[PDB]
Design a protein around this nucleic acid. Structure first.
Ligand SMILES: [Zn+2]
Lengths: 316, 515, 140
RNA sequence: AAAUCUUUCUCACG
RNA sequence: GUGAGUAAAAUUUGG
């Protein structure tokens, strides 16, 4: 009397007939699988060269240059940031800055590869400031050696459009760096480069919550000697700097797409592989179509550069 | 840095990708892939193997777990405003409650019995009929799944109807039981590492190992394969209803409904799709879409490829590879002897998500790493100290604390930086018991839970019924008067003993303090 | 009229599991918005203030772990640790004392935990969580 | 303006 | 701040 799983209902036949009348799949072609040795150094070199040719490079490192001191004290940094915000005609309300927009071009922003600064000693301060600002946007936030400013981006509608941000309002993060690029700004004898980044709340929360120090320390436990590199990520023994690797790590924290994780997984497969499918395992290193933006593109390019350098200096 | 590790490193030390992109493009791409496969020009979606070796469970009594049918997780509930269909994203609890109210049933088991014991599809169960339930259960809603490491472009996941959830729960429970019966590695009580060791034991005899993955795994599992497997294990009419709902399923993209005849929409059924392959041979250790087999000669490789093709498990040419000295399964890498491969492996970092919860998660991660031999104990101590300093730097400001007690952690205004060994042995101030991996929940965890309980989708004006007597079963039926009486009696008892709220009970601490 | 009638419309009797599922507030999910939520309205600050003065002076002071034995690195294996549940009488006493009914009720179930370990001793004994490297033994 | 279909709610009461 | 309406209100986003 107890109902069992295999119970047959009165509508079983009708439902089976309905399923039979419905469309069915068609047999697919049988694939041909060829197994060959994993990719060599030349293949990674070709991938890097193709990326470099297609996208090129920037003149300056943009926000990635904010990992080094701007050479100004707290008061000067606050003055420079506030005057830059005023210069670009940011609305002022309740002691905070707001950026107003009316129309959008609906086209992607130009993307290239950011050259690596010499070092990123202020990575921890920058990540903490990014974490704090987005939840305290509007005013200038200061740390021991650097400062930033997060400006909410809200639409312009008229007299009364919007006075406070919502859970989905994006933020323009503005930071200071040493002068010497096209983004220089001068005021009252103070010169500094002002660099901006447009981040939605999820990206900001992801970036700010990373632990730079612990991540680096854990990586250092079982790590081989890191070779010096140049501004382009190429092995430069004569004039390279080993500190640039820290910068690379910082970039991995700034890129919310974390394509470096995909490259790392594929490299782990590569190191353990004795034979891989022909012409298909290599395609796993081409992730340019999976991402869009300057920061993710730079992250992917420098992850590929790291893979190439590992294959070059410590062949496996 | 991950590229210069002596051992194996998957780069898990940073959180997964995230963004606010709308899920329309991903869902549309998945639907297009499923349609292309149904056209039979890209991948095989026709099952050819024989499943005669799967035991028949048709005599098993129909049992439904009530607990898993209620959860704070999202789901789709379909209503009819003016003939048209409107899909509302609610919580599974509210969706199931609405379904029971509409069908006027006391529990899901009664609902399924009534559904299975109707004379016709047009017969009414409450205010609806089986035909209307089947029509409504074919609607799905789309969302984006984020934080998946190694997926820069996030994938699309789907929210289904409560009736679909009920039938899926029944069928998946039975399929999991059958899988456990088929082989020992599929036992319910088995961790990823233990299954990895079992895999190493299984595939030790032969020479080459095929570490393989499936491509478009969800789009290549048609409703026909699911029906075949369910008939093989004897699901009766429940399998037929599930297959009928899957074949006619629709997905709400933005504001338009799209038909998706092919596929199963991102892992709704894992045990069934695994049985699709495990029911045709025994030279495999599939775990849904991540299998591992072994071979000696190219002929055996050809047999393996033919077996994979015949069971709708399309091998992924971009990730699958062959090894001789390593063994990869469930993202875990072992040696052919079963030993864990040296290196970081799958060790993952702990993001900053609270002054105290971060320390608890770091302690759990370090305990896991040390117990498995990933790193020595002194390295764990150093890393714990460094994380404590970082937390103090992040959270030691007036926004989170105003205290200065000595025993407090350095991140809450105190001056205490305990060692890992001291914390693990419970040799500390009781305030630190919460930071132990096995201790009680931390303050911030409770605060976050309470705040979540007040969100728009979960807010309710009902009178909470908590602190129930351990004896009363959860299947006992209650009414408003019963709840009021129980709450009043418990409040009176608590007031009679000089307490306003119950004291939290911890198993580990209670057992330790016992005489 | 009553919220019970509105929620469970048409039904005058519902299971305790369904009733509780509408008021569950002990589930925690680690999400990106943790810091923002903790900062909102100084909720964490207030919770810490309340804990330090109302709940903290009730936790019992348990003893530390002392027993430990020599261990050496060995092949990775799985350690099965069995934790028994509360008996009916123990559950009744704990409830009548004034403990949270939900926790005591949940502790009734027997539990078994599988943990990978890469250390062993001569007598093949079970270790504590995260202390197998040092050798602290469960002694049960 | 930028990591470009995203930075987009309404109403009642205190 | 609360409550409600909206194929939707951030525990968002399922197996
Ligand atoms: Zn510049």
């Amino acid at each position: 009397g107890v109902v069992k799983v295999g119970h047959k209902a009165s509508y079983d036949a009708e439902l089976r007939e309905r399923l039979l009348e419905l469309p069915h799949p068609k047999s697919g072609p049988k694939p041909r699988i060829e197994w060959v040795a994993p990719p060599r150094l030349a293949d990674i070199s070709k991938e890097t060269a193709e990326l470099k040719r297609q996208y090129g490079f920037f003149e300056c490192s943009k926000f990635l240059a904010c990992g080094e001191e701007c050479g100004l004290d707290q008061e000067a940094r606050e003055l420079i940031l506030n005057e830059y915000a005023r210069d670009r005609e940011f609305e002022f309300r309740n002691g905070g800055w707001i950026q107003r927009y009316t129309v959008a071009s609906h086209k992607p922003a130009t993307q290239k590869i950011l050259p690596l600064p010499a070092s990123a000693p202020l990575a921890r301060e920058l990540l903490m400031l990014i974490a704090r600002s987005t939840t305290q946007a509007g005013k200038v936030l200061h740390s021991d050696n650097t400062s930033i400013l997060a400006v909410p981006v809200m639409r312009d509608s008229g007299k009364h459009s919007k006075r406070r941000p919502t859970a989905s309002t994006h933020h323009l993060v503005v930071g200071l760096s040493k002068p010497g690029c096209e983004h220089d700004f001068e005021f009252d004898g103070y010169r500094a480069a002002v660099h901006v980044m447009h981040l939605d709340p999820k990206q900001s929360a992801n970036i700010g919550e990373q632990d730079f120090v612990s991540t680096r320390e854990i990586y250092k436990l079982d790590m081989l000697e890191l070779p010096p590199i140049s501004r382009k990520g190429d092995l430069d023994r004569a004039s390279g700097l080993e500190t640039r690797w820290d910068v690379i790590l910082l970039l991995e924290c700034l890129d919310s797409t974390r394509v470096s994780q995909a490259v790392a997984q594929h490299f782990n497969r590569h190191r353990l592989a004795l034979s891989v499918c022909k012409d298909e395992f290599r395609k796993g290193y081409q992730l340019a179509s999976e991402i869009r933006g300057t920061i993710p593109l730079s992250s992917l390019y420098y992850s590929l550069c790291a893979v190439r350098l590992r294959m070059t200096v410590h062949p496996f | 840095m991950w590229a210069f590790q002596e051992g194996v490193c998957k780069g898990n030390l940073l959180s997964g990708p995230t963004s606010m992109k709308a899920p329309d493009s991903a869902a549309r791409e998945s639907i297009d892939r499923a349609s292309e496969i149904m056209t039979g020009k890209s991948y095989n979606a026709v099952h050819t193997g024989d499943l005669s070796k799967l035991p028949n469970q048709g005599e098993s009594p129909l049992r439904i777990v009530d607990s898993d049918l209620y959860s704070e997780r999202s789901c789709c509930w379909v209503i009819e405003k003016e003939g048209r269909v409107v899909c509302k994203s609610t919580t599974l609890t509210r969706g199931m409650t609405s379904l029971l109210n509409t069908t006027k049933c006391s529990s899901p088991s009664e609902l399924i019995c009534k559904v299975l014991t109707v004379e016709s599809l047009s017969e009414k169960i409450g205010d609806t009929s089986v035909e209307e339930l089947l029509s409504h259960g074919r609607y799905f809603k789309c969302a984006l799944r984020d934080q998946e490491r190694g997926k820069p472009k996030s994938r699309a996941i789907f929210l289904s109807h409560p009736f679909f959830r009920l039938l899926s729960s029944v069928v998946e429970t039975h399929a999991r039981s059958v899988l456990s019966k088929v082989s020992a590695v599929y036992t319910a009580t088995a961790s990823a590492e233990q299954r990895a060791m079992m895999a190493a034991q299984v595939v030790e005899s032969r020479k080459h190992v095929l570490n393989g993955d499936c491509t478009k795994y969800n789009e290549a599992i048609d409703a026909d394969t699911l029906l075949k497997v369910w008939d093989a294990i004897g699901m009766g009419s429940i399998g037929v209803m599930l297959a009928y709902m899957v074949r006619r399923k629709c997905v709400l993209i933005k504001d338009t409904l799209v038909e998706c005849p092919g596929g199963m929409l991102m892992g709704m059924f894992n045990a069934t799709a695994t049985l699709a392959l495990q029911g045709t041979t025994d030279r495999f250790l599939s775990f849904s879409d991540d299998f591992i087999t072994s071979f000696n000669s190219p002929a055996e490789l050809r047999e393996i490829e033919d077996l994979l093709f015949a069971s709708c498990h399309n091998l992924s040419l971009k990730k699958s590879y062959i090894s001789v000295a390593s063994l990869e399964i469930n993202s875990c890498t072992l040696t052919r002897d079963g030993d864990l491969a040296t290196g970081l492996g799958c060790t993952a970092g702990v993001p900053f998500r609270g002054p105290l919860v971060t320390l608890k998660q770091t302690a759990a991660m370090l305990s896991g790493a040390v117990d498995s031999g990933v790193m020595p104990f002194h390295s764990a101590e150093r890393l714990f100290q460094i994380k404590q300093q970082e937390c103090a730097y992040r959270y030691n400001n007036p926004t989170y604390t105003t205290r200065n007690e000595d025993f407090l952690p350095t991140c809450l205004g105190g001056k205490t930086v305990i060692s890992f060994q001291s914390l693990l042995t419970w040799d500390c101030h009781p305030f630190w018991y919460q930071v132990h991996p096995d201790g009680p929940d931390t303050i911030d965890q409770k605060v976050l839970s309470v705040l979540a309980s007040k969100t728009r989708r979960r807010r309710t004006r009902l009178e909470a019924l908590s602190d129930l007597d351990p004896l009363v079963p959860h299947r006992l039926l209650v009414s408003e008067s019963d709840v009021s009486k129980i709450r009043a009696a418990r409040q009176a008892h608590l007031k009679s003993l000089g307490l306003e709220q119950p004291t939290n009970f911890n198993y580990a601490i209670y057992k330790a303090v016992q005489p | 009229m009553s919220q019970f009638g509105k929620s469970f419309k048409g039904r005058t009797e519902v299971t305790i599991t369904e009733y509780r599922s509408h008021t569950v507030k002990d589930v925690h999910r680690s999400l990106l918005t943790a810091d923002k939520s903790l900062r909102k309205s100084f909720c964490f600050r207030n919770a810490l203030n309340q804990f330090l003065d109302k709940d903290l002076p009730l936790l019992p002071i348990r003893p530390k772990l002392e027993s430990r034995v020599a261990v050496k690195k060995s092949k990775l294996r799985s350690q099965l640790s069995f934790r028994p549940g509360l008996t009916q009488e123990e559950a009744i006493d704990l409830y009548n004392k004034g403990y949270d009914g939900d926790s005591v009720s949940g502790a009734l179930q027997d539990r078994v935990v599988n943990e990978p370990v890469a250390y062993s001793s001569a007598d093949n004994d079970k270790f504590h969580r995260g202390l197998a490297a040092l050798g602290y033994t469960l002694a049960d």
